């Protein structure tokens, strides 16, 4: 379960896609947290809609937007207006009850206008 690098030019919107099994994660909410170290924490930046049936509705939180496709099985994260302080390790999480499974490790790179 290694990392996938997503790089985007600073000042533009970065789209991070997280595919998953729509059958396995049926009825599970999704979250996008920022990992600051090897021992955590993965501070939740944004999560999907509180009602899983409305996962298609965009849930904004600062400059990070999240949207989920429960049928097609695709979690889309949007880092609107990239900033150099947004670079780091993140996680795509699938929430079920009290536990949380990791879907994909994402490394956000910021390019200075390459």
């Amino acid at each position: 379960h290694n990392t996938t690098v997503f790089q985007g030019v600073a000042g533009q919107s970065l789209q991070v896609s997280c595919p998953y099994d729509s059958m396995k994660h049926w009825g599970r909410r999704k979250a996008w947290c920022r990992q600051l170290g090897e021992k955590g924490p993965c501070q939740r930046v944004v999560s999907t809609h509180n009602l899983w049936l409305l996962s298609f509705l965009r849930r904004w939180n600062g400059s990070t937007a999240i949207t989920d496709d429960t049928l097609g099985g695709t979690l889309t994260i949007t880092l609107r207006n990239l900033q150099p302080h947004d670079a780091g390790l993140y996680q795509c999480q699938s929430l079920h009850g009290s536990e949380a499974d990791t879907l994909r490790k994402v490394l956000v790179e910021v390019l200075a206008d390459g």
Partner: single-chain antibody
Amino acid sequence: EVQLLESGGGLVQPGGSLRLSCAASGFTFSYYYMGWVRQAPGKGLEWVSGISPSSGYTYYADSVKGRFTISRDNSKNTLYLQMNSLRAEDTAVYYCARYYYGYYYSHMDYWGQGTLVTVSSSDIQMTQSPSSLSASVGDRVTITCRASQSISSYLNWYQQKPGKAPKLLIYAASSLQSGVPSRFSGSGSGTDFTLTISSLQPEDFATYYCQQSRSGLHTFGQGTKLEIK
């Protein structure tokens, strides 16, 4: 395993030029931010420069801006630091350090043993209240660290044994780095932070520094000498 091998140090006259080289192995060098930290002989740590994986972002300190030039070659896994117009103020032991994923809000988890350079013939300050602290084995020591402005909960604590490279203990205000024993603990938010050791050990007698990590200049603290009472 991870190795940060430094080279390119020695003696130089004022106004000379040197090129510090830091060969890296064990980690994907094109993923992490890199940075240089020098330490004057018998003084505290000073953050020098930093660089982005794509080399598009170069952060320099005020004392070395314009004269130093940080660079990297991801194809050869090497970090460079071109030093020009070397004044007598630059006499220090330069350390090569790698940042964990990210730069802002991140921490230096791996350091090089350091190379010696001897010149022969959004600005926040960090102040540690106990400059010289003396305690015995088993005492309860609590070192503090005050910031000039709000730095949220992004502060790091480093332990530097006399004659070796500094090691990372606490990062992100209160997170314990992998490998650090459970005796160390951190706390604090905003502008006041504390480093607490429950019971001291024979290997805990060293120097401890606090480093802020919210702006582009990750300045260190003045230091705290911790020896036997």
